[PDB]
Ligand binder design. Structure first.
Ligand code: NA
Length: 129
């Protein structure tokens, strides 16, 4: 599923991401935009053989099992394919574990390079939330 901007903001809000660990909703929508272009089916392979999955591009080296990333951990205890669902619940629950990991949202390279220090509130402007 490809989300609309406000549609995603609302879904994320409903799932408790708004100000989760101090990150306003705009941060999460911005990260999703540049990670996946709001497409839950986004996948991308990394040079190390791991793969990023879903709307927040969660990586198979640490967070999910895709059966083809040798010596990886499955810290969110889920098949990576569950991250590609139109229901973002698994992605959001796993993201909460990631953002709690010590580095905050810096774990998402696109957030660090493209959202961090920008006016992120613009990503939820105009939305009925
Ligand atoms: Na893994």
């Amino acid at each position: 599923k490809v989300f609309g901007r406000c549609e995603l903001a609302a879904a994320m809000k409903r799932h408790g991401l708004d100000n989760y660990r101090g990150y306003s909703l705009g941060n999460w929508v911005c990260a999703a935009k540049f990670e996946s272009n709001f497409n839950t089916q986004a996948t991308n392979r990394n040079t190390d053989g791991s793969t990023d999955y879903g709307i927040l591009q969660i990586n198979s080296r640490w967070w999910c099992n895709d059966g083809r990333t040798p010596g990886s951990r499955n810290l969110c205890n889920i098949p990576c394919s569950a991250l590609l669902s139109s229901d973002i619940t698994a992605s959001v629950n796993c993201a909460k574990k990631i953002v709690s990991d010590g580095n905050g949202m810096n774990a998402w390279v696109a957030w660090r390079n493209r959202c961090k220090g920008t006016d992120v509130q613009a990503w939820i402007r105009g939305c009925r939330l």
